[PDB]
């Protein structure tokens, strides 16, 4: 199960990547540009003991992921903002 | 497609409802207690013209929903906090 995402083109030299990451903290998320690819990695935290009695129902699943997007030469990631359970990454030519 | 949720029991007189609502704004969300049921309604905003050329890929779907939970008599909703794409509702006996 990989996060849903959207990819938009704001114009020909710009892209906006939106990744659905509800419940993810900034420290669990990493973005890096390596060998011309943009890698977005979610590594969900060191486990926690969970009393299964306290859990009545668990419909929300959170699993580590890695998304990879080839960047056109010579594209740069300008910012990555985490807001409202969404990771927004602007990619500029 | 209804939002995923979790339901936890913090102890016997307390519950925590967590609803996955990434990208939802506070103005699109409503919680109300009516006839002993807790109703959580998401009504996604007045449409916007969307240039389908700007959309390369749209994996993130956002659809209006309504979740309903019977409250034990005499339970109250203490707060509803929207944070990190999650709606957290504490329900107290």
Numbering used by the authors:
A (entry chain A), B (entry chain A): 40 to 132
According to the publication:
Aggregation Suppressing Protein A (AgsA), an sHSP from the pathogenic bacterium Salmonella enterica has been reported to form dynamic oligomers.
Mass spectrometry of the crystals revealed that the full length protein (size 17.1 kDa, 150 amino acids) had degraded in the crystallization condition to a fragment with mass 12.7 kDa, which corresponds to residues 35–147. Continuous electron density could be traced for residues 40–132, and the monomer adopts an α-crystallin-like fold, with residues 83–103 forming a long loop which separates two β-sheets. This interaction buries 434 Å2 of surface area and involves five hydrogen bonds and one salt bridge. Structural and sequence alignments reveal that in AgsA, the equivalent residues to Arginine and Glutamate are Leu106 and Gly98, respectively. Leu106 of subunit 1 makes no contact with the dimerization loop of subunit 2, whereas Gly98 of subunit 1 participates in the formation of two hydrogen bonds, one each with Tyr44 and Asp45 on the β2 strand of subunit 2.
